[PDB]
Amino acid sequence: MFRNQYDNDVTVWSPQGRIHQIEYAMEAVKQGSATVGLKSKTHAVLVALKRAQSELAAHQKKILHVDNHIGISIAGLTADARLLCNFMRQECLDSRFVFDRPLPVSRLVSLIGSKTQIPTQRYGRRPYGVGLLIAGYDDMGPHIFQTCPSANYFDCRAMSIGARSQSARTYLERHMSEFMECNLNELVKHGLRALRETLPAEQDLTTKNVSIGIVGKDLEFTIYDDDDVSPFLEGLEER
Template sequence: MFRNQYDNDVTVWSPQGRIHQIEYAMEAVKQGSTTVGLKSKTHAVLVALKRAQSEIVVHQKKILHVDNHIGISIAGLTADARLLSKTQIPTQRYGWRPYGAGLLIAGYGDMGPYIFQTCPSFNYFDCRAMSIGACSQSARTYLERHMSEFMECNLNDLVKHGLRALRETLPAGQDLTTKNVSIGTAGKDLEFMIYDDDDVSPFLEGLEERPQRKAQPAQPADEPAEKADEPMEH
């Protein structure tokens, strides 16, 4: 995206009917590390991927505590999200810069567990399961495929589903570890808890190994290509 005369203020519309500052904030969310939220009848779970700029830098926290029953996970600009978790009035002023952070909010209330997604475009959605951030479409595909299983899951199984969905966003050869994963849980008679580092180990130990994608062998140049109407070997 390039700067132009219509992106100096959040109240200025372009001739195409777009608000560029909101689009910039939405793009920041798409570039952020992936986070997954899902719920059952009794619990709500957040699973987030933590990034570090280098091996000598500590991984940034991606799940934040709001109160005893609510927590948020972040995709986008971490500094903006930290401000959102502490202040309310600035988020209600339409003339301010849109915060470049997307949030998944998990908690437990009178109506049971819940997952909400909030966007820099001022929209929010009540979700059964959701993923935001970079490569989040791969996680959403997993969530959609297993949606019918979530409601009857206990806490441990629900966390495993979240980890599997998050793992789908990783490149080949990389897997989830205690250093790059953070987990948040809430439920009935259960305060919002955040699991980091060694506390994540029990959940990862019960997770099956990531299946390896087998590369198709290259076809020799002197052999004719398979016909379109013939089934390919697997």
């Protein structure tokens, strides 16, 4: 009852040393569908779940293309995701044009965080309400990164975000000791199994609500959907 005066603006501290608008913005990530990302010794894989909806009225894109070695997944607001994707694309293009070479994923993530921190301190703005999973490949090996509305980023071996991703995170943590010594097919199978845990018991993964993104040694970022995911789904178990 004593919070009503300290939770309307992002530039106001509460008597407990907290800012509630940032936490409220972080609460907006859990209103999107679950996403799973994981990497091996040579490959990085992104797996997303499409919303249960008629394909006639909407074709939503949860996996986007940034460069020839960088791809992202989104969960949250769509306008913020579009703005961030445009910023990353422009930065990569400028880097290539000025000094032709792949742009480091770590520097890209640092730029993203530096850009995101400002609205949490300026007045008249609001924090971004989107969480990103970034899979990339540069001259350091594959990378998996996670971004937060609180302008924080993490370096992960395998992470899941979205609505009801606790089961996926539990599965990933339980099976995290056998990811480096796997090929592409087994890694994609592990990702699909992890993503399947965010569904009720009766439903199963069909070739209508799954998207896959892969990048590796000599393979550029590619997105598979519709009938392109059948070879990956044809070898799975029951449950």
